[PDB]
Structure 1
């Protein structure tokens, strides 16, 4: 249960990758998704709508980390869907997380999220409200910790770095990172962030960007 996590959207492109590395790191992985993927024997697969408490709840029992990288496709231009799943459905993931005793939830956000006050479209708008819900939920004294990892027309090339000692960062070990592709990189950062969150609760409620 210290090595047990659920991946929400575990059938998808990012999800599958997450499953690979979590399994490789000796994690017991549940997968929650509304589509059954390429059968992996070593995974308790649950099928369901992340908007549903009834669907979600059993996939979360016994799990310490939830990975939320489920989403409708940005390309679909289905606004009511984005609204339903990214924005409304997100309150279900957090409350079901608390119900089941999940201790960490790691949201996959967007990098376009950094544009909060032409790249701001309705999808980005839902993902901001998503990140704001998830990082508002951070309650360390109840031992419920959250973060958001933000991977990516318009892109931030440079990000300011606070010199006041307020800047948090997640350390990796280069020897394990060289032969890793773009996604294996994004995925790795998720797993390191989650591991370092049990070791250092002051990362809760922050959002991170990746490098290189």
Structure 2
């Protein structure tokens, strides 16, 4: 019964899709943002600032996964949204008895000049990854898609030990997917695979291609 979830940034470019893919999978999606980006069926929309617990908790109690995707299109404007409000997303994900928080960070963070927007995406990710807590039944994960600047990682070493963990999917069904749709399929697969293996907990993750 507990396969319910919630998207922060559902009014964004990616949240839109996140929800889309998520409903098809058979999921009671709840959307939380500051505006109403569009209308959709079977998705209770919640509105409010993410920095406020008081405007947020209504949107989280009941669900077992939170997809945090929020990001604006400026220090305080970048600091408060990605840092201050994420710490509140962490604080009230615990209160509302959520079990699985999936952060949508970037790929620029693998760079250790780095802009300020990315200064806040490392701060954010660390926060989210720091809060991994299998004991209090709270597993967090970060996912690094590129884009939604002018420097991007093309290739990543795959350690020859098999020391690195990796997420497996079935590409026979997603033969028709687009770039954005693969960013979502990434978030979801980790999400549902967190529910089996707590040792994805704490880990950032890059997305691979599939022809």
User: TM-score, normalized by length of structure 1?
Assistant: 0.94
Separation in structure 1 between the aligned mates of residue 29 and residue 73 of structure 2, nearest angstrom: 32
Instruction: For residue 164 of structure 1, report the CA deviation from its aligned partner.
Output: 3.1
Separation in structure 1 between the aligned mates of residue 120 and residue 38 of structure 2, nearest angstrom: 29
Q: Name the counterpart of 1:79.
A: 75
Q: Name the counterpart of 1:68.
A: 68
* Contact 2:72–2:78, Cα closer than 8 Å, also in 1: no
Instruction: For residue 2 of structure 1, report the CA deviation from its aligned partner.
Output: 2.2
Instruction: For residue 163 of structure 1, report the CA deviation from its aligned partner.
Output: 2.7
Instruction: For residue 198 of structure 1, report the CA deviation from its aligned partner.
Output: 0.6
> Does the C-alpha gap of structure 1 residues 50 and 161 become closer, same or farther in structure 2, counting only changes over 3 Å?
same
Provide structure 2 residue ranges, at least 5 long, that are not aligned to the other structure.
none
Q: Deviations over 1:4-55 (max 9, x none)?
A: 0000001111001010111000000000001112111310100011101001
Q: Name the counterpart of 2:161.
A: 164
Structure with bigger helix share is 1
| Structure 1 vs Structure 2 CA RMSD | 1.5
Separation in structure 2 between the aligned mates of residue 198 and residue 41 of structure 1, nearest angstrom: 27
Q: How many residues were matched structurally?
A: 206
Instruction: For residue 140 of structure 1, report the CA deviation from its aligned partner.
Output: 0.5
> Does the C-alpha gap of structure 1 residues 77 and 184 become closer, same or farther in structure 2, counting only changes over 3 Å?
closer
Q: Deviations over 1:81-108 (max 9, x none)?
A: 1011111111100010000110000000
Paired residue secondary structure (1:171):
strand
Provide structure 1 residue ranges, at least 5 long, that are not aligned to the other structure.
none
Instruction: For residue 77 of structure 1, report the CA deviation from its aligned partner.
Output: 8.4
User: TM-score, normalized by length of structure 2?
Assistant: 0.94
Instruction: For residue 155 of structure 1, report the CA deviation from its aligned partner.
Output: 1.1
Separation in structure 1 between the aligned mates of residue 97 and residue 90 of structure 2, nearest angstrom: 11
> Is 2:77 the counterpart of 1:106?
no
